[PDB]
Design a protein around this ligand. Sequence first.
Ligand code: OLC
Ligand code: OLC
Ligand code: OLC
Ligand code: OLC
Ligand code: IRY
Ligand code: IRY
Ligand code: IRY
Ligand code: IRY
Ligand code: IRY
Ligand code: IRY
Ligand code: IRY
Ligand code: IRY
Ligand code: IRY
Ligand code: IRY
Ligand code: IRY
Ligand code: IRY
Ligand code: IRY
Ligand code: IRY
Ligand code: IRY
Length: 510
Amino acid sequence: MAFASLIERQRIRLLLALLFGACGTLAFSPYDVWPAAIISLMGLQALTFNRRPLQSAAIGFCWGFGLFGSGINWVYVSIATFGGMPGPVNIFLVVLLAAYLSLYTGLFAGVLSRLWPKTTWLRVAIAAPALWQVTEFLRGWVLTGFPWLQFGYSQIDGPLKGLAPIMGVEAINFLLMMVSGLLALALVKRNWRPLVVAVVLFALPFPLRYIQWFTPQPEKTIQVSMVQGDIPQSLKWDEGQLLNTLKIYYNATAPLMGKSSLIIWPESAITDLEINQQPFLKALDGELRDKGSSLVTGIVDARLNKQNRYDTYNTIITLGKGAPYSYESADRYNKNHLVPFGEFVPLESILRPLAPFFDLPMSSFSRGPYIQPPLSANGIELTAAICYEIILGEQVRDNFRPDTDYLLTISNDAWFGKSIGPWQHFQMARMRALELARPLLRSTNNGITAVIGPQGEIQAMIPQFTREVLTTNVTPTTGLTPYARTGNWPLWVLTALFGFAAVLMSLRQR
Ligand SMILES: CCCCCCCC/C=C\CCCCCCCC(=O)OC[C@H](O)CO
Ligand SMILES: CCCCCCCC/C=C\CCCCCCCC(=O)OC[C@H](O)CO
Ligand SMILES: CCCCCCCC/C=C\CCCCCCCC(=O)OC[C@H](O)CO
Ligand SMILES: CCCCCCCC/C=C\CCCCCCCC(=O)OC[C@H](O)CO
Ligand SMILES: *[Se@H](CCCCCC)CCCCCCCC(=O)OC[C@@H](O)CO
Ligand SMILES: CCCCCC[Se]CCCCCCCC(=O)OC[C@@H](O)CO
Ligand SMILES: CCCCCC[Se]CCCCCCCC(=O)OC[C@@H](O)CO
Ligand SMILES: CCCCCC[Se]CCCCCCCC(=O)OC[C@@H](O)CO
Ligand SMILES: CCCCCC[Se]CCCCCCCC(=O)OC[C@@H](O)CO
Ligand SMILES: CCCCCC[Se]CCCCCCCC(=O)OC[C@@H](O)CO
Ligand SMILES: CCCCCC[Se]CCCCCCCC(=O)OC[C@@H](O)CO
Ligand SMILES: CCCCCC[Se]CCCCCCCC(=O)OC[C@@H](O)CO
Ligand SMILES: CCCCCC[Se]CCCCCCCC(=O)OC[C@@H](O)CO
Ligand SMILES: CCCCCC[Se]CCCCCCCC(=O)OC[C@@H](O)CO
Ligand SMILES: CCCCCC[Se]CCCCCCCC(=O)OC[C@@H](O)CO
Ligand SMILES: CCCCCC[Se]CCCCCCCC(=O)OC[C@@H](O)CO
Ligand SMILES: CCCCCC[Se]CCCCCCCC(=O)OC[C@@H](O)CO
Ligand SMILES: CCCCCC[Se]CCCCCCCC(=O)OC[C@H](O)CO
Ligand SMILES: CCCCCC[Se]CCCCCCCC(=O)OC[C@H](O)CO
């Protein structure tokens, strides 16, 4: 009796939704069980059937809470190591983040149930992917966004990967939601017709994975090195640890000079202000040039502006052959999209006049422009993105140029230790190489350092948590994928057409 009440049946769906959401985490690296994405989304689509909209919203929230609570709780590692807060507060902040992101999946399920209450193929295959595109856009946009755990990234090594160079990863997000809805409808209606459509829609993109939208340029093959310094995270200012860090990177780099055309040091590899390291940079620049090598490295640049204040940038500088170092060189990249709660706090500008001055951080990061030219070194054009920025597919594509030779991302993922976070990050980085058909050079502090090929494949990699140099031959590519040509406006046009048709039909019951 009691287990069969209406409130109990709804609470069972909430529990199932939590589990199906958590199943979705298995789709991403390091687990890479890409069928888990479909299982997860089937649960979301099926458990929201035949619900009042507020019930469906609660189910979508709990599904999100399962997904995000199991999938991004690795942020705890950084909070607990550097936040100085008590254990229960650290857990609460993680629960808070997961609940915040689950508002968007609750939003999805509530609106889907409100406008498409009946269990139909139009709900699951037309309305749902268009609506999901919108709510996932809002999750990636509101308060500068956090578009982490999009299931399309789980197809980097999967049957649907050929879709990404055509319309971008969000087209895989779209198709996965559509295919999983049809499977949910087939299960619940016990009907073979939606299953056949789902398998057909899922299988049609398979041969696209064999398209090379690029041509290799073996006449430009070079040896590249990426120095994984494995520098432990600092807490106070210490010139002694700064000098040991420069020592590690220089000594690893010296024997590569004249052999690697390109050497890369990761995000903030030089943990001092650029203005404070002019002798070292000039001396290093001459050594590199005298041997025909170039260096690209992260650094912090507090740059005095015409208002006689300092704009502090998270920066990539260039040195050596084809990139003569100068503090006034334009051959540099300034991070545009700061990491929320890492490099700034959302809404902190609205609140600054209330804060005691002694409680404000010593300084804050400014932002580079949304589009910056490629870096140039040793005749090589590198489209750069620092750390988190590599997950912003449209922004990387908007910075990409036809004459880009390689994608470049440098990152310091040490904040998150041995967790799945660095693996999820790395998996998303690979999607950019596939989307734009360029090899990606990913240089990190302690992992994951790798060369990704122009179809997202791992061409070379070194283990995490080692002080080591990755040295390999890399070949640039040329050619434009359709997605490089367009960006995601074609997917948005399809989203509008599905959304228009679905909302029109939903209104037709008037
Ligand atoms: C029904 C779904 C949950 C309902 C919503 C409540 C949120 C859960 C809050 C606390 C659970 C305990 C969290 C797991 C145990 C703590 C984990 C921990 O202590 O982590 C320390 C360790 O160092 C890590 O590496
Ligand atoms: C097992 C623990 C008991 C749980 C009981 C079953 C679940 C309750 C039903 C729906 C979730 C509650 C409402 C969730 C949305 C309300 C607002 C919220 O909690 O999220 C705020 C967000 O954190 C802002 O940043
Ligand atoms: C264990 C519950 C038994 C219920 C049976 C059905 C379970 C639902 C299916 C998969 C859940 C597994 C979730 C994926 C595991 C995530 C691992 C994790 O959270 O790692 C923490 C941090 O994010 C990384 O360091
Ligand atoms: C009336 C028919 C039903 C309504 C529509 C059915 C859905 C169509 C699905 C995908 C669009 C396929 C074409 C768009 C994909 C390619 C777009 C693209 O990016 O290619 C352009 C670029 O210029 C290349 O170089
Ligand atoms: Se969804 C799982 C339900 C499964 C079994 C039901 C019987 C449970 C989701 C947990 C909600 C976490 C609430 C987060 C929170 O406390 O936010 C704080 C916020 O209000 C402060 O602004
Ligand atoms: C409701 C059906 C859901 C999806 C249907 C797909 Se058919 C299942 C077998 C599909 C077999 C594909 C290989 C799976 C995989 O991802 O391997 C993991 C490995 O890479 C590292 O864990
Ligand atoms: C990996 C996590 C798995 C957790 C185990 C769950 Se087993 C239940 C399978 C069944 C899948 C969901 C239940 C279907 C349902 O009840 O929805 C129909 C309803 O909407 C119509 O009104
Ligand atoms: C219903 C939703 C409410 C959301 C808020 C609940 Se967060 C649960 C905290 C759970 C507390 C776990 C204990 C952590 C710990 O490490 O305690 C030792 C510490 O004092 C030493 O630093
Ligand atoms: C009150 C405000 C809410 C409005 C409700 C409808 Se939002 C319509 C989406 C508008 C679509 C703009 C998309 C531009 C873009 O390219 O962003 C990348 C995107 O694909 C994903 O990251
Ligand atoms: C781990 C996997 C989780 C869920 C994946 C299964 Se998708 C369920 C499809 C459901 C299959 C459709 C059944 C059609 C039917 O039974 O009716 C036709 C009958 O009349 C012919 O004799
Ligand atoms: C990357 C985005 C690609 C978008 C392609 C849209 Se193709 C239109 C599919 C049509 C939508 C679902 C049709 C399934 C169906 O008809 O099954 C229910 C019926 O059998 C019950 O009698
Ligand atoms: C009905 C469509 C007609 C034409 C379709 C083009 Se060929 C169909 C094969 C479609 C292949 C999709 C499933 C592949 C898979 O199961 O994953 C492989 C696993 O090893 C990855 O880890
Ligand atoms: C007030 C509502 C919340 C604001 C909305 C945005 Se949610 C905050 C993002 C979650 C916190 C960021 C997670 C760290 C990370 O993504 O690092 C990747 C990279 O840095 C590797 O080193
Ligand atoms: C289901 C909703 C629950 C939401 C709150 C979950 Se808090 C669990 C924290 C778990 C934090 C991730 C663990 C990763 C790890 O073990 O690495 C540590 C090591 O690297 C350090 O250097
Ligand atoms: C249900 C159907 C969904 C299909 C969506 C993925 Se296939 C889309 C077209 C895939 C092919 C895109 C064409 C790229 C191109 O630029 O070729 C034209 C050029 O040759 C002319 O001068
Ligand atoms: C009714 C069908 C619904 C499905 C949507 C298909 Se959109 C057709 C694309 C048609 C292809 C046109 C390509 C235009 C181009 O490459 O201009 C460069 C510009 O995007 C740079 O911003
Ligand atoms: C219930 C939900 C149904 C869906 C209705 C909302 Se359709 C949003 C229209 C959005 C119209 C254009 C979006 C901006 C754009 O296309 O940016 C392209 C650029 O990034 C490079 O391709
Ligand atoms: C029962 C409490 C649910 C707790 C978790 C919900 Se999070 C949803 C965030 C966004 C809230 C909007 C989603 C709901 C919706 O759209 O239902 C249509 C109509 O607006 C209202 O009946
Ligand atoms: C309504 C409020 C809901 C949102 C709660 C947010 Se909890 C804060 C998580 C804090 C996560 C910290 C991530 C950054 C980091 O760990 O280092 C990054 C480094 O500074 C440079 O990339």
